[PDB]
């Protein structure tokens, strides 16, 4: 089997389930949690399950964790303008934390669909080229048009071998 406890965390299907896509302002995210204490239980589960999901969606965001530096856990974000966003996460579950930072610093569903829609316009169906970029390579793949000579030989009147011979 797959090593480690909860091996599903190390899967692309689980890393892409994160719904926290930070904005352009967020630059650094610092997590301070305590290894023990009933109050900090959620913060530990948030570092064990969701940090992988957050860093996968925000690869250009620095995430640094510190253990047992304060009596209580908390999150702190550092924006590009110089503003700091403190977030007390004591006495909260990992879902409440994941849902709370999505409302104050995460993008909404309206801002995401737009970005995706732009990409669809990058691949024009009318264009012809390699299969990697375009759907069709040549226009002989379109019924009605003249087929490729490799498959269907052209008439002797349409080949430059005989056009020259017929003329001379």
């Amino acid at each position: 089997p797959m090593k480690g406890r909860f091996p599903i965390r190390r899967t692309l299907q689980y890393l892409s389930q994160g719904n926290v896509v930070f904005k352009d302002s967020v630059k650094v995210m610092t997590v301070n949690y305590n290894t023990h204490g009933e109050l900090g239980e959620g913060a530990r589960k948030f570092v064990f399950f969701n940090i992988p999901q957050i860093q996968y969606k925000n690869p250009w965001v620095q995430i640094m964790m510190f253990k047992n530096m304060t009596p209580s856990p908390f999150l702190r974000f550092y924006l590009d303008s110089g503003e700091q966003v403190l977030v007390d996460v004591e006495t909260k579950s990992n879902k409440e934390i994941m849902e709370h930072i999505r409302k104050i610093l995460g993008k909404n569903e309206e801002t995401l669909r737009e970005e995706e829609e732009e990409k669809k316009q990058l691949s024009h169906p009318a264009n012809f080229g390699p299969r990697k970029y375009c759907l069709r390579e040549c226009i002989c793949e379109v019924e009605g048009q003249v087929p490729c000579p490799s498959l269907v030989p052209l008439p002797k009147e349409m080949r430059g071998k005989y056009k020259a011979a017929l003329k001379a």
Partner: protein, 119 residues
């Protein structure tokens, strides 16, 4: 790549196999190869008539108007495709080449007539 000088141009990039040509309209640098790297593909042109006897020509007018406004030039064959469509005026030589054909065919009607008349 960086070319000394040069400019963008909207030309035709030949494609297809032997005796089966297929041009694809593209905006590419002036010095780049004919079928090499391009900035954007702005249409396609199938010279050979289809079953219906018609030549197909695709044009991304919204993008052709963008590159012409960014400093792009046009090739003579491509300026004759935009004149046949009504996007540009009929190229001067598309008109003069038609007049030359008229006089040429009228010059052949004389010899044909004389032969049938004289002989």
């Amino acid at each position: 790549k960086a070319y000394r000088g040069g400019h963008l141009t909207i030309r035709l990039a030949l494609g297809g196999c032997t005796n089966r040509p297929f041009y694809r309209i593209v905006a590419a640098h002036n010095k780049c190869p004919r079928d090499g790297r391009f900035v954007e593909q702005l249409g396609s042109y199938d010279p050979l008539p289809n079953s219906h006897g018609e030549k197909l020509v695709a044009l991304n007018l919204d993008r052709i108007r963008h590159w012409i406004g960014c400093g792009a030039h046009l090739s003579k064959p491509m300026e004759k495709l935009l004149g046949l469509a009504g996007f540009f005026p009929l190229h001067p030589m598309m008109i003069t080449n038609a007049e030359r054909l008229r006089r040429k065919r009228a010059r052949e009607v004389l010899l044909a007539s004389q032969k049938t008349d004289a002989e």
